[PDB]
Design a protein around this motif. Structure first.
Motif, PDB file in Angstrom:
ATOM      1  N   UNK A 143      20.410   1.389  11.941  1.00 51.20           N
ATOM      2  CA  UNK A 143      21.285   0.462  12.663  1.00 51.20           C
ATOM      3  C   UNK A 143      22.409   1.177  13.407  1.00 51.20           C
ATOM      4  N   UNK A 144      22.891   0.560  14.480  1.00 46.47           N
ATOM      5  CA  UNK A 144      24.047   1.065  15.210  1.00 46.47           C
ATOM      6  C   UNK A 144      25.164   0.032  15.148  1.00 46.47           C
ATOM      7  N   UNK A 145      25.974   0.116  14.098  1.00 49.50           N
ATOM      8  CA  UNK A 145      27.000  -0.884  13.827  1.00 49.50           C
ATOM      9  C   UNK A 145      28.130  -0.879  14.853  1.00 49.50           C
ATOM     10  N   UNK A 151      31.449  -6.200  22.377  1.00 48.43           N
ATOM     11  CA  UNK A 151      31.042  -5.212  21.384  1.00 48.43           C
ATOM     12  C   UNK A 151      29.554  -4.911  21.522  1.00 48.43           C
ATOM     13  N   UNK A 152      29.180  -3.659  21.279  1.00 48.90           N
ATOM     14  CA  UNK A 152      27.791  -3.242  21.424  1.00 48.90           C
ATOM     15  C   UNK A 152      27.153  -2.904  20.081  1.00 48.90           C
ATOM     16  N   UNK A 153      25.950  -3.424  19.863  1.00 53.38           N
ATOM     17  CA  UNK A 153      25.168  -3.108  18.675  1.00 53.38           C
ATOM     18  C   UNK A 153      23.777  -2.664  19.108  1.00 53.38           C
ATOM     19  N   UNK A 154      23.079  -1.933  18.246  1.00 49.12           N
ATOM     20  CA  UNK A 154      21.764  -1.434  18.604  1.00 49.12           C
ATOM     21  C   UNK A 154      20.912  -0.943  17.450  1.00 49.12           C
ATOM     22  N   UNK A 196      19.975  -0.797  22.767  1.00 51.68           N
ATOM     23  CA  UNK A 196      21.262  -1.466  22.587  1.00 51.68           C
ATOM     24  C   UNK A 196      21.348  -2.808  23.306  1.00 51.68           C
ATOM     25  N   UNK A 198      24.614  -5.801  24.378  1.00 50.25           N
ATOM     26  CA  UNK A 198      26.007  -6.229  24.323  1.00 50.25           C
ATOM     27  C   UNK A 198      26.130  -7.725  24.061  1.00 50.25           C
TER      28      UNK A 198
ATOM     29  N   UNK B 117      31.094   3.181  24.559  1.00 54.55           N
ATOM     30  CA  UNK B 117      31.078   2.866  23.136  1.00 54.55           C
ATOM     31  C   UNK B 117      30.720   4.111  22.336  1.00 54.55           C
ATOM     32  N   UNK B 119      29.056   5.317  18.250  1.00 55.24           N
ATOM     33  CA  UNK B 119      28.466   4.908  16.983  1.00 55.24           C
ATOM     34  C   UNK B 119      28.389   6.065  15.994  1.00 55.24           C
ATOM     35  N   UNK B 122      24.543   6.228  10.692  1.00 56.67           N
ATOM     36  CA  UNK B 122      24.322   5.191   9.693  1.00 56.67           C
ATOM     37  C   UNK B 122      24.157   5.790   8.300  1.00 56.67           C
TER      38      UNK B 122
END
Lengths: 228, 214
Positions: A143-145, A151-154, A196, A198, B117, B119, B122
């Protein structure tokens, strides 16, 4: 109606041989010359081999001189490309391409029916040839918290072989703002891409987000929920 | 051997404008021995111009080639949205026949700053012996952008790989990802992980960073 069809591509360990076949149809196969053009992973075009209408003139690329061999069968509409001692640097999509149906001698006179491999007016869909020693493996999905507008997650799909992998978010529902990056070959001979998306800043606490990774060559299917 | 050099690398144009692609040959080539190819994404290449300045089969009126010696050009009168692709030039006056590295024709839009951004690796990955720090650049134009990694004010090199999307279909922008891969051992030896992005849409290099375990 005119079409060229490649075949014979696939995974080949370094040092191994392989034979490519091209079925010509819809035209007078006899008059035309032919040639092979390869294209590496996201790169330009490189001239590999070529042969004239009768096969009396066969030139090869600089990198492949001696290793590759081109042949044709006018009585069956086929163009062959024998590839020996394949290195990882030969990994590319190989296009079967049709040459001219004529030529022009030194004195500037045009010879009808004596085709050659100057340029290529008809291209096939190409065949993929992968040269690697690595074995087949399913991907690990990390995961990419999102941490600290929006906010971006991926999802980090890492260490898989071979291509391709398909990444979808919340099955088929989520599409807007999704970026799936082209896979990158690592030093370990394994591929790895990132995917990813957004989302609104305050959208995190309410709705969950899952990425559907699907790697068919390994029967691998993974659902990964992403959270801070 | 004749080396073909296409310029510019990327041709930023708007629908309706005129486009002139160039090809700089290392040696003199007869004007009748030159060709141009078009390749849209995910498709096989297609012949546009052969014999120097002759349109191939079913090629639109706007396309035209020409030139001699060491300088050849391909010209699109007014470009259509179907003309946005990669264009390769080819010579065949000297053996072996060679291609150019290619010229990308992109849709030109206004300048847009990247949304940067970052990251952290994990916990699922750290429990497996590796560590991947990801730096993301979102919706940025033009394509040119420099990304440099800094671990405790120390510049990195060779241990990072970049990947960038094709030009977006909606807003005509790009997106880039830079992945810094480290062993779990060397990852624990450090605290500050920075990612310095330099772009045209930015007045000065933006630096996103985090402290490990904070």
């Amino acid at each position: 109606e005119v079409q060229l069809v490649e075949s014979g591509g696939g995974l080949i360990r370094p040092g191994g041989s392989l034979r490519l076949s091209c079925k010509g149809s819809g035209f007078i196969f006899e008059n035309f010359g032919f040639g092979w053009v390869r294209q590496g992973p996201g790169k330009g075009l490189e001239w590999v081999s070529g042969t004239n209408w009768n096969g009396g003139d066969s030139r090869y690329g600089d990198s492949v001189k001696g290793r590759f061999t081109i042949s044709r069968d006018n009585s069956n509409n086929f163009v062959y490309l024998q590839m020996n001692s394949l290195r990882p640097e030969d990994t590319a999509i190989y296009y079967c391409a049709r040459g001219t149906d004529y030529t022009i001698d030194d004195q500037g006179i045009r010879y009808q029916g004596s085709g050659t491999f100057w340029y290529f007016d008809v291209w096939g869909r190409g065949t993929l040839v992968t040269v690697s020693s690595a074995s087949t493996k399913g991907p690990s999905v990390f995961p990419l918290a999102p941490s600290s507008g929006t906010a971006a997650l991926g999802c980090l799909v890492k260490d898989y072989f071979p291509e391709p992998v398909t990444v979808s978010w919340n099955s088929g529902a989520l599409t807007s703002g999704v970026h799936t990056f082209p896979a990158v070959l690592q030093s370990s001979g394994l591929y790895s891409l990132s995917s990813v998306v957004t989302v609104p800043s305050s959208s995190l606490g309410t709705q969950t987000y899952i990425c559907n990774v699907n790697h068919k060559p390994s029967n691998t299917k993974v659902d990964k929920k992403v959270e801070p | 051997e004749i080396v073909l050099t296409q310029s510019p690398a990327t041709l930023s144009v708007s629908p309706g404008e005129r486009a002139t692609l160039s090809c700089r040959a290392s040696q003199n080539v007869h004007p009748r021995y030159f060709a141009w190819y078009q390749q849209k994404r995910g498709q096989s290449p297609r012949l546009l111009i052969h014999s120097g300045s002759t349109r191939a089969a079913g090629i639109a009126d706007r396309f035209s080639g020409g030139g001699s010696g060491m300088h050849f050009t391909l010209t699109i009168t007014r470009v259509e949205p179907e003309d946005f692709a990669v264009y390769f030039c080819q010579q065949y006056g000297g053996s072996p026949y060679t291609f150019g590295q290619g010229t990308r024709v992109e849709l030109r839009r206004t300048v847009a700053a990247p949304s940067v951004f970052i990251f952290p690796p994990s916990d699922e990955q750290l429990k497996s012996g590796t560590a991947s720090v990801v730096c993301l650049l979102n919706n940025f134009y033009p394509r040119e952008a420099k990304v440099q990694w800094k671990v405790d004010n120390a510049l990195q090199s060779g241990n990072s790989q970049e990947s960038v999307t094709e030009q977006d279909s909606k807003d005509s922008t790009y997106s880039l990802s830079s992945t810094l891969t480290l062993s779990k051992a060397d990852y624990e030896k450090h605290k500050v992980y920075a990612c310095e992005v330099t772009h045209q849409g930015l007045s000065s290099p933006v630096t996103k960073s985090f402290n490990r375990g904070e």
